[PDB]
């Protein structure tokens, strides 16, 4: 309705005025007095070889040693990052995986893609071989991201413009999250795991309540589709990555854009973004074959992680924040520290 | 140096590495084709000739070559978000319904799709095996309704061969790269010979890729 559209615009204007009223200063302005972090030189400590196709997703285990990586050759390889040893090599039924998740307990590993099925794999089996514990079907679009709340329930975001909370035991969607106009491309679980945020192709990120089972806030500002999203370690803010070559920090409480991380020399799109343990550093993977380390409070490009021959598709930071691993389309998964 | 368990874990890693390499060598010889039509373009007919949701894998062997045909017909979402999955596809098999030039425009939508796919930044060094299906129906459709209804400024006689040749010429357009080659072929209902021209097209594309890698192309 035209009246309801004018009401929606009036609410947006009221909202922007409410932010501007509470925006007495900016993040750049307030953090002008703090000492800027000195230039960071991170060396490639280890290179993980074995993949024979473009790596699309990787996720660190909670022990900060084991990590799983998904590639287009239809293989999930679980690496011992410390020794570069292969703990597992799981053949995939559909060799079109675009996301992979490692359970917080370290018992299960989930993957999916164009098959529209979030295949879950049990590692701790008595037979001693990794087998498909459950195949979660119901999404009508390509699966983009999946994240484990615990060993029982998993939240997944698909290309049908819908995020879905599943129960792995029963094997259907416990709760369905709808509202996105474009395809949802990313997920991020808050430290408390009470709320999660998802960025979609409609150039907007929406905050969702897991228990309630519907959206809470919607954050706009991006000029193009969002590819990645990640919460701030404290769990009150989150950063996003899009194709317009800009990272954008948003605050759950303020309900607005706080800072922009855009350099004029960068025009290529952003694939994946991640924070440090303290949250002072923001690491974003770009299509120019190198990841850039941004100061979360200065927006100054602190360092550049270069060495990959193709697009850096994914990167992950360990729970103890000891190292950073970046996976690229050159079938290599390098670890930086 | 390494303990008994660390050495046993290294041996397991070496065994996995060997298995991955063997599986890689076995899968490297397979030819990968992306079947990409537009609704009732004759995707179901051609895939039936060669041989719930998600892409449909159709693998068939023909003259010491294992062709893998990917039929994406479930993903109704924006293409660009999954087009980058098929970087190393050998050729793109595009299907077009010739009979659907006037009835709906359907041909315009097919031209717009082909324009988008052929000029995609991911599909630059990838040849297109274009199939102009349902030419038997077009045989009498052209004699009843003139082709000018769909495409204006045709400025030609309304017969079978020339009309199909003009559509082929328009489809051969929108190709701004010199490394691409469009292997246009017109098929009707059932021929039992489309697998041969696909093989003939693929082996030409492989020869072209080999000469490019050598440095003669």
């Amino acid at each position: 309705l035209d009246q309801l559209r004018q009401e929606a615009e009036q609410l947006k204007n009221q909202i922007r005025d409410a932010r501007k009223a509470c925006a007495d200063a900016t993040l750049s302005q307030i953090t002008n007095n703090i000492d800027p972090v000195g230039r960071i030189q991170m060396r490639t400590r280890r290179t993980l070889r074995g993949h024979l196709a473009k790596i699309y997703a990787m996720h660190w285990g909670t022990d900060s040693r084991l990590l799983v990586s998904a590639s287009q050759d239809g293989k999930l390889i679980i690496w011992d990052s410390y020794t570069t040893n292969k703990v597992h090599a799981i053949p995939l039924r559909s060799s079109w995986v675009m996301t992979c998740a490692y359970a917080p307990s370290g018992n299960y590993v989930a993957c999916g893609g164009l098959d529209n099925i979030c295949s879950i794999y049990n590692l701790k089996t008595r037979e001693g071989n990794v087998r498909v514990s459950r195949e979660l079907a119901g999404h009508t679009g390509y699966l983009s991201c999946c994240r484990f709340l615990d060993d029982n329930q998993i939240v997944t975001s698909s290309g049908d413009t819908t995020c879905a909370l599943w129960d792995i035991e029963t094997g259907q969607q416990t709760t369905t999250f709808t509202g996105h106009t474009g395809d949802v491309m990313s997920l991020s679980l808050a430290p408390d795991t009470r709320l999660f945020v998802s960025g979609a192709c409609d150039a907007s990120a929406k905050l969702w309540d897991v228990r309630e089972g519907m959206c809470r806030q919607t954050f706009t500002g991006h000029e193009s589709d969002i590819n990645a999203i990640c919460f701030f370690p404290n769990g009150n803010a989150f950063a996003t990555g899009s194709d317009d070559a800009t990272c954008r920090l948003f605050d759950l409480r303020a309900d607005q854009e706080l800072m922009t991380y855009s350099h004029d020399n960068i025009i290529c799109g952003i694939t994946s973004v991640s924070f440090s343990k303290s949250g002072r550093l923001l690491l974003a993977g770009y299509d120019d074959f190198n990841c850039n380390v941004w100061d979360a409070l200065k927006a100054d490009r602190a360092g550049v992680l270069a060495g990959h021959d193709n697009r850096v598709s994914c990167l992950g930071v360990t729970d103890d924040g000891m190292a950073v691993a970046t996976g690229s389309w050159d079938s290599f998964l390098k670890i930086w520290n | 140096t390494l303990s008994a368990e660390e050495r046993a874990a290294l041996e397991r890693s070496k065994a996995i590495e060997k298995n991955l390499k063997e599986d890689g060598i076995s899968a490297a010889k397979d030819v990968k084709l992306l079947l990409l039509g537009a609704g009732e373009s004759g995707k179901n007919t051609i895939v039936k000739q060669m041989k719930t949701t998600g892409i449909v894998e159709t693998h068939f062997t023909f003259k010491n070559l294992h062709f893998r045909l990917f039929d994406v017909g479930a993903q109704r979402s924006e293409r660009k978000k999954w087009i980058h999955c098929f970087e190393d596809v050998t050729a793109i098999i595009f299907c077009v319904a010739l009979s659907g030039y006037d009835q709906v425009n359907r041909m315009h939508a097919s031209l717009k799709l082909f324009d988008s796919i052929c000029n995609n930044k991911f599909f630059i060094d990838t040849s297109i095996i274009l199939f102009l299906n349902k030419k038997d129906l077009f045989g009498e459709k052209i004699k009843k309704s003139p082709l000018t209804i769909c495409f204006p400024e045709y400025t030609g006689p309304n017969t079978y061969e020339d009309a199909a040749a003009y559509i082929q010429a328009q489809f051969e357009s929108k190709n701004r790269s010199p490394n691409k080659e469009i292997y246009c072929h017109m098929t009707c209902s059932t021929d039992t010979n489309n697998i041969q021209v696909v093989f003939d097209a693929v082996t030409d594309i492989i020869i072209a890729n080999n000469l490019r890698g050598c440095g003669l192309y």
Partner: single-chain antibody
Amino acid sequence: VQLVESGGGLVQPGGSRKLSCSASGFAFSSFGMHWVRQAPEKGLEWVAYISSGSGTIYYADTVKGRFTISRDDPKNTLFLQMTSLRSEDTAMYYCVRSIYYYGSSPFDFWGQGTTLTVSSDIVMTQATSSVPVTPGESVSISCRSSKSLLHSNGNTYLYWFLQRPGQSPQLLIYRMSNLASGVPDRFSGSGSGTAFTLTISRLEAEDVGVYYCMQHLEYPLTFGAGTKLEL
């Protein structure tokens, strides 16, 4: 998941034998397999080991050359070709599974074993023997090593096994701390370098048995004397 060993009976000292173990219910191909023998009125003793794919084979110094271990992946069968026999070779030969990756628990499952009768190294010791304990209170079992098991990587390769009377040994604790799957939370192992302690919070009826502390720093693998718990 089960292992069924075959071959045994009365054997002449000059004769030869071939013990075959049939593995079923699990992926035998990816599991390294050990042979552990137990002489009557004597603790466990490591005999031989063959890895997944038959890539690495190790033997004890007492059976080097005499015995020949082998595996058949297609039919999932493990063989132990005993060429020369002696009077001290009599024992209950157990076939044990062993999977080796980061976070794995080797020696987790043991076979039933077959009674065969015939007509330098890390000196793992306990110095405990029989320990009479009533059910209900806590239990402390001490094992000691002549060499420090704390390797530079940062884990101590110690393994506690529970052999109930008239039953095969069961893995309790692996790497001194981690409890095996199915083992209640009562059991808890501790130690530092050389001296190690196995502690049970409460003792029940099924806890009665013999406890063996095996090191896994380097082959040959050495078992403890065997601490017996009873009323």
